[PDB]
């Protein structure tokens, strides 16, 4: 039987008899995610090249304003706003929404994979909505998950239940179901980090990334992926397994990656795909934040990969 | 003005006062990768998925369907045919065709960027067409390119009058010029290669590498960039300047890439643009082909980076 | 705010405390009409004409909605156009609504790209007895939802319920229906008067006198207009935006008319009503005979109640 | 073989040995047209409605851009436009081409079908263009059609060869060859105009439209189709025969229909489809014209239709 996610989302809400909220703003995100593909695949470019004689913000644009008239949202953070976005008071709604609309898009001079990334959190506290509203850790997320603009659409969405593959039908606009709760590999064989820092590494990266080129144990090498677009790095990771580091560096000492709207939706997806996210000193899920642009480092992916990293992190102490 | 792959190609071969084949040759290919672009992004799939109760095999029928049909071909070689297609006698037409229908379809499953390639000579005797019509060095091509089906679809066709890219807008079908004339950087600033197969790198290519990472001067290290798809990594190689390798060693002394349909049409691009593309023992573009299927390694990219190799290349030589 | 179908049905479920199967029935419905408009727009016809060288319209279009509200979970019963018998979902899937529909109107005209045009209506069980054909026996009046989508120059959903009649855009660009007419009201009177005129010579004679009212008038004031498509959908929904007339009258020939009661007539007249309109056949209401066949027959006369009254004086005068 | 217009449009120019400059002018107009259709389809339609936060006068300003910039024509003439237009001399070319870019667009309220209709003329000469060169009868004409936005789109183009229909495939944004060589019915069964004002007639109109509710020799009543859109009745009569009327009374004495851009392109496809056009004195097609915007009466359709009407027409005086 064919599913869509509307109606997976209604169905899934009716087995746990909740308001309806989530789902609501979860067909409000689907909806901006419609018109993202849309405007990324390059709908109407002609009309700005004379025939009839900026895309980050659009995206943006496009789930803040979907997300505020959803009614399900009092807090809003994103990748384009400085400040969090406090949701007028005759829109609030109870969930707190962290969000990169379109990660990657620094590099979409060359048609490189995009997507935009989401956690949907409750709101914790009973204080009036702020800032504060969007600094629970990972482990408390409802809902998270990623949209992929490459060769064709992807929304994976991961929840209690599991994590959940749906394919974007162009001729329909319609999220169509097509890999059910998706699980990872238990080991991959691929990795994926930018090696040009390889001079900034600090030993215990060093040491495991050349375990892969130089297995000890004359196992057949790991192959190296790195697209350099979140999004397509970790689902890559996500369908093929393996292993995704982005690790700290002299440029940046407390990681690159951010850990609200970048880290714990990616981190969500694989420990809810029977995988692991980790910083090399905790779980990326379990950091507690405290400020809603913070980067963290991050180790992800193939359950056997991220403890065999571990491992090595462990004998550099 | 505005102006679009057609317009762009009768305004051409008027120019030059030819018959029309090559147009009707490019508009049938055009056709084509509209149709490949559709399938990619997963148009009808809710029908797969019983809504109403072989990507590679379909690209290479596209392809060679809308050839033979452009009365403008005798000639096809594809990555998907063990033999070159000599077109019907009634539909012969001047040129020979060499194409990878679907490039990285291999990995689709990941939704990472796929491509088609293609590269058109034109035929040299008046002989009863063969296989041996398309064993011409790339230095013969008359037009080359590909089509990028990556966050958006791109299409970039080289000829004598420079390199030049079309988007292509979902919303009416047609390939719009976006970027006229492009010419590659000097010099890049990215690195290009399967960085797991190291321990069987060729040693040439181990130092390069390593100087890239680990630069002697006061420079910069080489941001890494590995999409493991060509059309994508030739793509943003062309657009930020850089160096791309697939390279011979050891286990495999004339590389991975097909020469016909992969390396030749790159190296022409390339070329065209005011790059380089090499074997380390010559220019990709005069390798004399005797089997249509041969390897050939490819180094290609921002001028001063393929010397760069090149000198490294020779230190081993 | 940005209204859509999606966040419409679920801003009117919440309100209503209802346990979503409307919802999640409609949600199935408009997919459907999603996947119907992509197919007779002919997306994909290339491949038809061997480009890398198989349904018919009204078939498929059948399938893709019987196969969208079976899987929806909140059907029992469905009657459609193409089916003699009426449907009975198999248990597993059961949910409490009865579903009439003509899945692609005026398809047998799809020849020369005339607009398109799917009839719905929707109904609640009225019984506890195992479901059957007999629970789709319930006058119009019973509807709990009905509507039409219209594959025209674009494609729109025009949605009636208990809080009137909404009108939504499809943009194809996103697969989302717009809400682009919020509780739409026809006029008290237009200028168009809408049926087939070249069958004139088997006219009811309450017919014949009527048009001849409006080509000619007493008053002298200026005639209507004429417009007939040809398809239903279409001439109904230019009814409901132009104000004026439509009519599929009785005759000597055809009694009963010829349109059908339950998902051509019955939701074209509930979404007539909803828009502060008329529906009749002559005798009666639309909306009020009691059916004894699914694929039963009416006469309809429908449009601006100024207009529908103008045809009932006349009717009226020949019995 | 598959055929598409663009395809068909170059191997005719190549059959005619001609320049590509009609072929040039009919891509041009092409692109414009799925540019219309696309908007008429609504596309966009949610950011118009507020989700981030004309159509006539669209439409003609798609076709006035398109044509410019095909350097093909000189002298546009629009329904839209109270003058001709003169093409400024870098983009002059040698035809004139009359259209209404969007017939039927005042009653789009009911999202009634709408068309674009079309003709072409050779240049008068040399003589910088003019208005002039647009007063031109019919049987001048070198090609002509309409766009048709019904239940799908589909082109109609008309030419010395005969008359072809495409379907607009919107998956591709391609227009298919479906219908060749199209041939009216020598009689039809239907006929078509507006009923309703009856009280107006000509009295051969009044009789003929007699005889086709009440047959004289017995046989059965033709039906009658009215969409009061012209581009649609034209083309419901094209495909399954009949007669098209919208003639002249009294207080309209040469009808209401424009004779440039309405009557003389259907009368042309009509001619060329094997059926009549006539505006009961004279052939439309034969008409000498005074002024651009200039109206005709016009009975159109099957031969043995339109030569009936014209019989009445005879004894009527
Ligand atoms: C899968 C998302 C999800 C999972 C669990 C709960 C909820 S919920 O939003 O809190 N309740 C909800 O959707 N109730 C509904 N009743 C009827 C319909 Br139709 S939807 C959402
Ligand atoms: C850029 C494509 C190109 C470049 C060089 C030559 C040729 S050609 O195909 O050999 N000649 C050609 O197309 N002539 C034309 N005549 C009329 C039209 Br409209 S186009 C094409
Ligand atoms: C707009 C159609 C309509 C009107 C009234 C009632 C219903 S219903 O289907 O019976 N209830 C319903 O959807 N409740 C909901 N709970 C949560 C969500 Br999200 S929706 C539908
Ligand atoms: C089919 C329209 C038509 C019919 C007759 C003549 C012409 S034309 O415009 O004068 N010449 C033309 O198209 N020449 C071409 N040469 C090569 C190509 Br590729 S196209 C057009």
Redesign the interface.
Known sequence: ??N?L??FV??E??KARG??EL??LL??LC?AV??IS?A???????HL?????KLDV?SN??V???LK??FATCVLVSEEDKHAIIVEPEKRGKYVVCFDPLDGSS????????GTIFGIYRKKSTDEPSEKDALQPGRNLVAAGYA???????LVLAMDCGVNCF????????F???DKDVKIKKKGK??SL??????DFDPAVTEYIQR???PPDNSA????????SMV?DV??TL??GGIFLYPANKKSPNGKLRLLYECNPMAYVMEKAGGMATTGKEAVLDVIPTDIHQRAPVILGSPDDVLEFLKVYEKHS
Not at 107 to 114: F, G, H, Q
Not at 167 to 174: H, S, Y
Not at 194 to 199: D, L, S, V
Request: glycine share 12%; hydrophobic share 40%; net charge positive.
């Open positions: 039987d064919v869509t509307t109606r209604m169905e809400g009716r308001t309806g789902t609501q067909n409000s909806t419609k018109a849309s990324v695949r390059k709908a109407g470019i002609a090249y004379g025939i009839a004689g659009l644009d496009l803040m304003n979907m008239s959803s590099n979409i001079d060359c048609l490189v994979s995009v992929l603009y490459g060769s064709a659409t992807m394919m974007l039908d162009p001729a329909i606009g319609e169509i179901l097509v691929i990795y930018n090696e040009g820092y390889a001079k892969k080129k130089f090498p790991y192959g190296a992926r790195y697209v350099g397509a689902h890559r369908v093929y």
